[PDB]
Structure formats: C-alpha cells, structure tokens
Design a protein around this ligand. Structure first.
Ligand SMILES: *[C@@H]1O[C@H](CO)[C@@H](O)[C@H](O)[C@H]1NC(C)=O
Ligand SMILES: *[C@@H]1O[C@H](CO)[C@@H](O)[C@H](O)[C@H]1NC(C)=O
Ligand SMILES: *[C@@H]1O[C@H](CO)[C@@H](O)[C@H](O)[C@H]1NC(C)=O
Lengths: 56, 50
C-alpha cells in the first residue's frame, strides 16, 4: 500500500494522501515476476531486515 | 495533484480488488482494449441516432 517516491538521490515508499517516507523493504513490497515486462521500472536496493538478524 | 495515468489506472484496479501488477504486466492489452472500446462508441453514435 502506498507509492514509490524520490527527490533525486533516494527511493522511499509513502502512503498516498500524506507524505510519510519509509525505507523500501520486503515488508513494504510484494514481488511479481521479472524486470523485463514492466514499463518505467527503476533500479534500487530493497532492504531485508532478516539479513542483519542472521549476521548478529 | 498530478500522477502518471498508468499509475492512476493501477490504483483504480487496486480499488476493485485486482492487484496492481495485473495492470503493469497487461498495460498494452488494457490500453488496446480501452482504445478499441472507445472506437465502438464513436462508431455507434455515428451509425444511429436512436
Ligand atoms: C533527497 O535528497 C537529499 C540530499 O541528497 C537526501 O538526504 C534525501 O534522503 C533524499 N530523499 C529522497 C526521497 O530522495
Ligand atoms: C517518459 O518520457 C520521456 C521523455 O520526456 C521518455 O524518454 C521516457 O522513455 C518516458 N518513460 C516512460 C516510462 O514512459
Ligand atoms: C538496471 O540494472 C541492470 C543490471 O545492473 C542493468 O543491465 C540495466 O541497464 C539497469 N537499468 C537502468 C534503467 O538503470
């Protein structure tokens, strides 16, 4: 839920009706298939909070 | 508040309980079905007054 947003250096996800920028994560997002199908898709990291929990 | 039309349509899909990726994956089919469906209005109203 919400929308992806940037101001020219970072990508964040916000709810639609009030600016509330969050880090883009596997909790904030769902997958569907490969890059090649979507028009206007962009390259950015998606964070996974499990990986530091496995590292710690 | 401006928004790209393909993203407005993904929200209008997400409003009827169809997941956003169904639009972005089928965007060419949806655009062609829409453009064709408006052509039938133009031809219907051109063809008869009734
Ligand atoms: C926007 O630009 C500033 C400076 O680079 C940066 O601190 C901020 O995190 C960026 N935010 C977004 C949404 O791009
Ligand atoms: C958006 O518009 C620019 C021209 O201003 C064009 O080069 C680009 O390919 C377009 N991208 C999409 C996702 O339509
Ligand atoms: C996105 O990343 C892939 C792999 O690094 C690269 O081939 C592709 O050209 C990139 N596309 C854009 C729009 O940066």
């Amino acid at each position: 839920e919400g929308v992806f947003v940037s101001n020219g250096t970072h990508w964040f996800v916000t709810q639609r009706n009030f600016y509330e920028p969050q880090i883009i994560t596997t909790h904030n997002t769902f997958v569907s298939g490969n890059c090649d199908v979507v028009i206007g898709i962009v390259n950015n990291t998606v964070y996974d909070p499990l990986q530091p929990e496995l590292d710690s | 508040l401006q928004i790209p039309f393909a993203m407005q349509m993904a929200y209008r899909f997400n409003g009827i309980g169809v997941t956003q990726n169904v639009l972005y994956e089928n965007q060419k089919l949806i655009a062609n079905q829409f453009n064709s469906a408006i052509g039938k209005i133009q031809d219907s109203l051109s063809s008869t007054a009734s």
